[PDB]
Design an enzyme around this catalytic site. Structure first.
Site, short mmCIF file in Angstrom:
data_model
loop_
_atom_site.label_atom_id
_atom_site.label_comp_id
_atom_site.label_asym_id
_atom_site.label_seq_id
_atom_site.Cartn_x
_atom_site.Cartn_y
_atom_site.Cartn_z
N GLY F 36 0.77 -1.23 0.00
CA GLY F 36 0.00 0.00 0.00
C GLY F 36 0.80 1.28 0.00
O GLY F 36 0.21 2.36 -0.08
N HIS F 129 -10.67 28.84 0.91
CA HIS F 129 -11.23 29.77 1.89
C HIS F 129 -10.27 30.93 2.07
O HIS F 129 -9.42 30.91 2.97
CB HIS F 129 -11.50 29.06 3.22
CG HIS F 129 -12.50 27.96 3.12
ND1 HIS F 129 -12.21 26.72 2.59
CD2 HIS F 129 -13.80 27.90 3.50
CE1 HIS F 129 -13.28 25.95 2.64
NE2 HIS F 129 -14.26 26.64 3.19
N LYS F 192 -30.89 29.09 10.37
CA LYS F 192 -31.32 27.95 11.18
C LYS F 192 -31.38 28.41 12.63
O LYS F 192 -30.37 28.45 13.34
CB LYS F 192 -30.36 26.77 10.99
CG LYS F 192 -30.83 25.48 11.64
CD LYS F 192 -29.67 24.52 11.85
CE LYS F 192 -30.16 23.16 12.32
NZ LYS F 192 -30.77 22.37 11.22
N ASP F 210 -22.82 27.86 -3.35
CA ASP F 210 -21.92 27.38 -2.31
C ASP F 210 -20.61 26.97 -2.96
O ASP F 210 -20.53 26.78 -4.18
CB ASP F 210 -22.52 26.22 -1.52
CG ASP F 210 -22.10 26.22 -0.07
OD1 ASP F 210 -21.20 27.02 0.28
OD2 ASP F 210 -22.66 25.44 0.72
#
Lengths: 305, 305, 305, 305, 305, 305
Positions: F36, F129, F192, F210
């Site tokens: 792996g 961001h 909310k 978004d």
């Protein structure tokens, strides 16, 4: 082996912390030369000691920051064991100042790197923007909050029917947290489309909450907007009383009945002359935090059961 | 691909250098916020460019240094190719200021490390103390000298019988070098046991030489001491006109007939009002040095045959 | 948890320091391979210990420095707690060697960076040039002075009328300090225009003071110059007996009556054969400094009331 | 913009490389002071240039390495563009020297870190142990091989029936590779249980292959062991002629008929007096490698079709 | 002040070590988000504590390594005193995987640098390749060996006439050491010219020794080769049971009578189903090593008289 | 001298970028070993070249990030000139995942430091961001925006009366910017407290905006809330189609009529089976950005007049 040193930004707060620790400030002559350069010399023996420097980077920001880094260098070359920089207000870290050019520095990163380079081991601030700046430090940062003291003072004066109103849309999470803590009261938001206040405000006592007051400005406008519709009294609570610009003609020529702030910034004389401005003190919490950092005790256990 | 930027310390010298390079200063808005923090934003495209920042760290030292490092960070985050900091006068580097505590910082080291950390690639200063501070930089430092211009101005005014007198005992090597260059004239030393002048001074024209004038002080006292014994005229030549403290009542109430300085520091208005103070310019030499650094030509070939 | 190790430069001084600390040198086999590479292996357990390495970087400088850095690496990979490098004489740090090319290295900076890179935590030297090199270290440097021992030996032999004469113009500050300490006696300077001796020297006992003696040279010439004018006896006091070049035919064929040095350098056999060379010892002061560094006590309190 | 500089370890090889590049060695005065410290000064202008330093770290290893790092520092402070350290033989990197204490340094790591710290940009060695030491460098390392030249010389002398014998068990991979390249000849191993030779050796010509010869020793013993059983001639081929210890009484008092080495080490006079020792030259390959590194061409394309 | 934390690679071994230390694993929630990113949060107070993280970098290697570094960062930002990474099997460090392109990374160096960058203070591995990788760490590495436990288990089962056979030519030193320790028995080597077994193997019990078993492969082929010539039984002893590829059809379809491994890797279920595979435990040795590292006692004294 | 390499995260996007640059992907074999671990080898000559690595750190995040850093190390050891990491989606940088323990890492900082350590010179991401993470990089970061392409596709389909609705309260600035750009249409917010939709939504076409869609979730709930009150159609526009968790039963069992995403993440097959999900492409913008970064042209000039 704990020793306390102070610069010239916050000498009163440093003295209060030293009094609450049953100790005295160290003997260091921090002053200015004739040409304006910072002069620092340590008259004590700090070898192997656990040093704390209490120095807010408030206005004048550059002189205070230079004092801080020069003291750190002087203590590091004197074989100090560990140096903790207690900075009640971190200066170059404001996020609500963005002029649009897209070619701008990140000054909080610059200050953090310079603090780490000069030899700082830990940082202890008050009400930092705890989502961004803590990643700029490669040294541990202990962020303590002034919210418990402001809230315990809020509960003292027996508001009629408190409602927490965020002065803007960015800081709504803090307002929600304070509203939940303050007897789980109602919730409101000021939105600048003019002002678009959201929620019910009539015949109640509003408590604006913020981490900073720079020039009145947003808080004064929000208070006016929510007092247009019959709010009984308006109380503005802040942690850092920067009070730059005018901030003395904005507060007097406003409808805010009481502005409550902490003592992280010296709160110059013209603000002291105002009758509707009252200051709290963070000396007890900062002293407990310093004592717990020195003895490797839980800081988070100070704020929760 | 060479671009020139300037701060707020030396805007006139930066403009003169830009004029002699047949270019213009870059478009960067360097200013102050309301609370005193440095605001910097770049309105030009500096990607891959060869940037030079002309910013002396003169009084106010801390604000100027913060402007410098913030501009360096803003240019480094804008993908600038190479950043050279042209600092005509390096601020925290004076050696003739030692108050005896033995627990003191090395501020020149602090400034050098912070410059290297924020992203400076090269440094170009004028008349640095070229024995100590060049080891504090991990980036190449190009030290150019204001001695040739001052000396070529010395030779212009046709002194009667020049003699070079060092104002103190530390700076005798520079006085010896200038005396050797200036027609291999005589040599003299001022020693502070009172004053102990060494050598023959009578019926001659004396030329005190120094790299700095802070408050008059030593130079005024040396001029008085060597004019007690019949020196015709006394000329004091310096590179950095710091002129702090009084430095305007010391020069007027003195026997020095002409003080000649360079333009590394803006030389505030009260000094301008004095009639016996004349300033030279380093703009030509600095422009040539910048052009040679950009094109990778020999800087040392500028000062010797 | 203090352990002492030594290389091959100063084994006698290391043994004296170990004797005065009531301990023994650690078990480390420091030797050479067949091809000349430094071989180092630690036969003790130094995990978590407070290690001190006593290794002067004297001639042969490169082999001694390589031994030092290889021992530091071997101890750092053996989980040693703190490593202090006690270097009685710092090698690549002389300032009185300047051949004029202006393209030269700063070797003291190179040595300081390599010491910091290999894993040194502190440095403890004797009579370093305490204005420049301490800025080249990012680790704390404890500079102890051999002046008190030399001066207390000066006061022992009852000079007729002592006068302190600096061998050159650079080192006049140290001569002034020693003259002030030594009963506040008179003051004199040797200046090389030939020799230009300043002050009164006739029928007195002169005490030349320096931090180093390389090849006689300047000290022998100064002694001859000030004995041309009827100086009774000439005593030369130095801290570091480098004694390179000839330094054995210069001292014998000279008018110096006694050369007093410290034991920071092994002082090879041909110098031992000379009758007018006497060596002091710094083992007591170095042992006290090591003990105070280990226990975090005031080093500066060792030299003043 | 390529410039070549050399120290004092390999001046002849540096001159040969400079001749094959149709250039001349730079003007740098690399010498010793009176006390043994390395003196370096650059008399050329190396600003922005592409500098190569040809300096093997052979015996005396410490002096040569100090010369190398001091030259690197002197060139880095002279604003050199890129510095490549051409080290034909890397000194502190031998793996066949392990005295059992388990508390030992890793000297190759120390040298690599110090080279990176002083300001080296690239490394170009010959026949390094290309499995371990290349990870110790944070700068690119170009490892060129002396095997093609030795093998092309092997094919010249027309061996009867060549068989490649590894002198020990560690270096069998290189022997297998050379045997495969050399007409895919047979294979043999010397094993030290006494000697345990593996394979058929009778009436053949054996070619021992190694990267180094220190003191004869293993190679002489292997040659004796495989000549006990009727080997016609024994040829030993090595890249680095260290030849320490005796290495001149071992080779003469041996049965090896010809030892062929490269010129990475100056091969002192006593070895030159031997008749059965012949040296090749790597100057052509090193010159091609330097030219390809400067022009950013494929180094690996030099060794394969 | 010792605290133990574990990830998700080896939870059983971590629990065994915690049991043998008479303590319990710390309260840290180490899990995965929905998108596969590692989620780590510390629910304990680790300020000033001595933290140990038990996390093998076994398959899946990348997820385990990311868990390790994220836990290290989370503990470093929580003001942990010292962080030791106990890695029973170091992942990206295998040397027997070389595909020939010569443009390959050094992944062990990458992992070591990332561990040092994220804030690891010490490393404690088991049976690392103790000649190369220890130089890739700038933090101390404590390499403990699984050889004593495997050998003490070897001596238990009373082999008829043990002979140690190295599965290949690279790992002959370890086989020689184990043969010397195991009653100084005979010696044998498998060589891949087909297989070229060296030594006497007939009517004996062979004990193949290796530090790893990946896919059977070399060990199965060696067992077949040395059982072609009448070896009674073949036992293969390894430290790290990687068991990738098939490693379950290779072991079943083989002539090896018993494979003994340690518990550094969880040894997935299909291997557990095999009857001829038995696992030992390193929990006692690792617990003793952790206790000795915390208390600064001699680790090497654990393995020798 | 520009070369393009790709890993295994986004091979299709890398091929599209290579096609739009009229070039081909470099020859590097990036694969997995049996156990792996990431296997990387470069079959091209990249010496002195300008290398770009196109590797999104999408799910599986750890394997992709390990591939990226291993490729960077392999290219850095192959003497690559400059390495730019084109990361269309930065993995460990999400801010909307905060489980309350206050002892958590900053994984974006960890990834940035590891990228800088392994040898990355520049970063080019999409819709980062852009207030926090750009300070975590000490290398320049070029943040390009997918907003222009999504908006130009929005304008294509001729919405009846578009209104931009932010799915939550945190991302209102981006919604305001897109609403201003999109013909200066109306504005709405989902809050909310249940859902508290602010503004007028009736008989209009809503366009939720978004930067990410993880599991439907917030976007599906917002679409349901604003379609309870007679919204004609609901279009959700996102840049990064993470689509973890279910994200295929949430989208099908929803009232969203069309979800438009970019191609920064491969968008696995089950999402492809959905009819109401359509993907755009950033290959043109990324190719232009790569070309402008290589040639040192203005990236910001690509997005504005």
């Amino acid at each position: 082996d704990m020793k306390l040193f102070a610069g010239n930004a916050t000498p009163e707060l440093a003295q209060r912390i030293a009094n609450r620790l049953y100790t005295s400030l160290g003997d260091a002559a921090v002053g200015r030369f004739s040409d304006g350069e910072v002069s620092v010399q340590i008259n004590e023996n700090v070898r192997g000691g656990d040093i704390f420097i209490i120095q807010s980077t408030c206005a004048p920001t550059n002189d205070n920051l230079m004092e801080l880094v020069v003291m750190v260098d002087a203590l590091r070359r004197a074989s100090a064991g560990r140096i903790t920089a207690v900075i009640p207000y971190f200066g170059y870290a404001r996020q609500d100042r963005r002029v649009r050019s897209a070619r701008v520095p990140i000054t909080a990163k610059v200050v953090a790197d310079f603090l780490s380079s000069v030899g700082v081991d830990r940082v202890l601030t008050v009400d930092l923007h705890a989502e961004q700046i803590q990643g700029f430090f490669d040294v541990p940062v202990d962020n303590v909050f002034g919210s418990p003291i402001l809230l315990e003072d809020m509960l003292q004066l027996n508001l009629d029917n408190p409602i927490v109103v965020s002065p803007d849309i960015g800081g709504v999470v803090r307002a929600r947290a304070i509203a939940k803590l303050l007897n789980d009261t109602d919730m409101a938001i000021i939105d600048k489309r003019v002002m678009h206040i959201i929620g019910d405000v009539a015949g109640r006592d509003c408590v604006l909450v913020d981490d900073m007051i720079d020039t009145g400005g947003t808080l004064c406008k929000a208070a006016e907007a929510l007092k247009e519709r019959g709010a009984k009294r308006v109380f503005a609570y802040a942690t850092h009383p920067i009070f730059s610009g005018n901030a003395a003609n904005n507060l007097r020529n406003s409808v805010i009945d009481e502005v409550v702030v902490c003592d992280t910034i010296p709160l110059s004389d013209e603000i002291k002359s105002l009758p509707n401005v009252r200051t709290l003190t963070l000396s007890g919490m900062l002293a407990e935090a310093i004592r717990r950092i020195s003895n490797e005790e839980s800081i988070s256990a100070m704020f929760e059961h």
